[PDB]
Amino acid sequence: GEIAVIVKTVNSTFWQNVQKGADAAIGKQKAHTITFQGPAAESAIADQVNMVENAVNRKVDAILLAPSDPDALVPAVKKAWEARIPVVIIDSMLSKDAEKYYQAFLATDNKAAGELAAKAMIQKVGTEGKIAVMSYVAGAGSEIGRVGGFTDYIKANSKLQIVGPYYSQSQMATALNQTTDVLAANADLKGIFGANEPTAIGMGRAIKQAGKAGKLVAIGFDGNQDLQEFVKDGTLEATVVQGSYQMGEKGVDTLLKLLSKEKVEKFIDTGVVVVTKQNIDKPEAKNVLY
């Protein structure tokens, strides 16, 4: 009675909060259990494909998948569908090609979330000057909309010059180095966007280490303890926080509905909160912080 939860990496406070939500949902019923697995890094795409294939081959009851690539994971998800195994996608989209093969998609509206981050950037930076974009895995499902939404909004609503994008591969240490390097290369940098949890943490640490905290406008994504501290201490002006717990909890609950041959909502927006010093202790923020 296995429900296989497969995420981009287990080495992550973000994915551990998704696990928390999944654990909560599963613990309210007896018939199914979950496994929680992911490769060693978000860039390990082939390893994730192997995990999904293996789940199909051992005939799990259902799969909750945060695909590390929107295209590379399609063949394995098609195999799940051919095996009559319900699949729900969380966090990061699959290609349009795959639409027939899974039954729900729960995620941030990433284009909208990138736009909120860009608007926050402009309101603090203005509309002239240079900003840097620190991204994670190029073309990963959540990344396309998030960074594209950000970038397109900056272009349409300012004459800010974008430096980058740079790609951290979701490695904190890589983001730290890339940020250190962008700062050293661009003395006139007015702002900097870190598009996911590890990238934003490395970014914040780089800014602090460079002696530049508060001397340019930094905006992040996600809401773990490090990022909360960076908002509170003024290193980051804002961080855009997702419904990570909800993706796990409602992800599992959606699969449980499908396993009972019930109707589900195919596209579920798990919401966002832009967290700043002005709202960090409000209930709406506390509900998504972790």
Ligand SMILES: C[C@H]1O[C@@H](O)[C@H](O)[C@@H](O)[C@H]1O
């Ligand atoms: C580490 C984690 O960061 C979240 O921001 C992304 O939504 C998710 O796809 C993953 O990259």
Ligand SMILES: [Ca+2]
């Ligand atoms: Ca313009």
Ligand SMILES: [Ca+2]
């Ligand atoms: Ca360097």
Ligand SMILES: [Cl-]
């Ligand atoms: Cl790979």
Ligand SMILES: [Cl-]
């Ligand atoms: Cl999206």
Ligand SMILES: [Cl-]
């Ligand atoms: Cl993806």
